[PDB]
Amino acid sequence: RMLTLDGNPAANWLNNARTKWSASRADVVLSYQQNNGGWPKNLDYNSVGNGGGGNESGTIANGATITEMVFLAEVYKSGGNTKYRDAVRKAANFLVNSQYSTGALPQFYPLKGGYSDHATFNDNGMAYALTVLDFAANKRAPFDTDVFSDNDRTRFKTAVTKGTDYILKAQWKQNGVLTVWCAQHGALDYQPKKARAYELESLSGSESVGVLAFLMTQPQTAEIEQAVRAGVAWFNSPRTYLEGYTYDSSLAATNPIVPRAGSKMWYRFYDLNTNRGFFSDRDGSKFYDITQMSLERRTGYSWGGNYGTSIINFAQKVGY
Ligand SMILES: O=C(O)[C@H]1O[C@H](O[C@@H]2[C@H](O)[C@@H](O)[C@@H](O[C@@H]3[C@H](O)[C@@H](O)[C@@H](O)O[C@@H]3C(=O)O)O[C@@H]2C(=O)O)[C@H](O)[C@@H](O)[C@H]1O
Ligand SMILES: [Ca+2]
């Protein structure tokens, strides 16, 4: 009931994160870890100066925490310096502490109020956090050192199970048909939620890839295979993707959605009920013609992309 990890987009993310920066930057990465064990925000460890730790909320926004901990785990594996092992231990403790009883992972922790409290798939936050904890649970590199004990691994396995349970319950039923996920759901009510003003309740063409990838690392029970099949069917349906089109971000001044032979496009946001791709703006509005959007949002955010390609090709590979 296990699928290969070869080609799994989440596994790929994680193995890349192991070597994301130069090893020489391990100390600057480390210098930003908050006391609670999470990182205060996403950072370019190639341009910034040294941090001074801190006591702010940790976050999984934009790859924060989950990237740093995979990277430091590799550095520890490679170099042996225990301060990096300790950092990784606090990061994983941070992740499990952040988890609600339902299995949901918030974007910021300690909780800050507002949308950050929600179960956050945005930026592959929750799916990739669970992928990290799962690799740690299963002694997979770079977590195949002494960084964790048997009891740690049981702790993480419990976390992954609860997170899996959350994903399965949150998966959206579109007029009776299992589909995908919103970029954020209520931690306690499982309902799709808004985030920032231009991020409305919807199916996420972006984050659902990562969610499916994460499920595909899990043992494929009947209900997990159904969920992955249903999710994959949704990505691969002519009611979901635009045919003969691509998203070209360099053309966002007026319209990034352009005719392109041999190409499919997926919307960033799909209507929960009609599966109509849509657009928003800083006024919280919802509309279907990207040219009506403010210049700043059309160029400042991706309203579509090649999202489905990687999960569809992967599902093919494994016989789904
Ligand atoms: O499509 C994307 O996900 C988008 O991500 C980045 O940009 C988004 C956003 O569009 C930006 O305006 C910027 O947002 C501001 C702050 O940086 C952020 O902390 C948050 O509070 O929202 C602020 C805002 O509303 O403007 O950064 C956002 C982010 O990092 O998620 C990329 O820069 C963008 O090119 C695209 O990939
Ligand atoms: Ca983002």
Instruction: Tell me 103's DSSP state.
Output: S
Residue located nearest, by CA, to atom 13 of ligand 1: 300
Q: Which helix (H) or strand (E) holds 207?
A: helix 207-215
The set of residues, in sequence order, having a beta carbon less than 8 Å from that of 209 and lying 6+ positions away, is 9, 235, 307, 308, 310, 311
**Residues 119 and 170 sit within 8 Å (Cβ to Cβ):** yes
Closest by CA to 61, choosing from 97, 107, 106, is: 107
- Give the count of domains, the chain: 1
- Resolution in Å, one decimal place: 2.0
Amino acid present at 239: R
Method used experimentally: X-ray
| Structure tokens, 188 | 């306690």
Residue among 43, 194, 196, 202 to mutate when testing ligand 1 (max atoms within 8 A of CB): 196
User: Which one-letter amino acid corresponds to residue 250?
Assistant: S
Instruction: Give CA torsion, residues 114, 234, 176, 186, to 10 deg.
Output: -10
Q: Where are the alpha helices (DSSP H) in 9-124?
A: 9-17, 26-31, 66-79, 82-98
Judge whether 104 and 96 are in contact, CB under 8 Å: no
- 45 φ, ψ (degrees, to nearest 5): -70, 5
Which of the listed residues 301, 303, 307 should we mutate to test ligand 1's pocket, taking the one with most ligand atoms within 8 A of CB? 301
Range of the domain at 277: 1-320
Q: Rounded to the nearest whole angstrom, what is the distance from the C-alpha of residue 238 to the centroid of ligand 1?
A: 29
- 109 forms bridges with which residues in the sheet? 58
Q: Are the beta carbons of 145 and 72 closer than 8 angstroms?
A: no
CA 277 from chain center: how many Å? 20
Q: Return d(Cα 215, Cα 227) in angstroms, integer.
A: 8
In CATH, what number is assigned to the domain containing residue 242?
A: 1.50.10.20
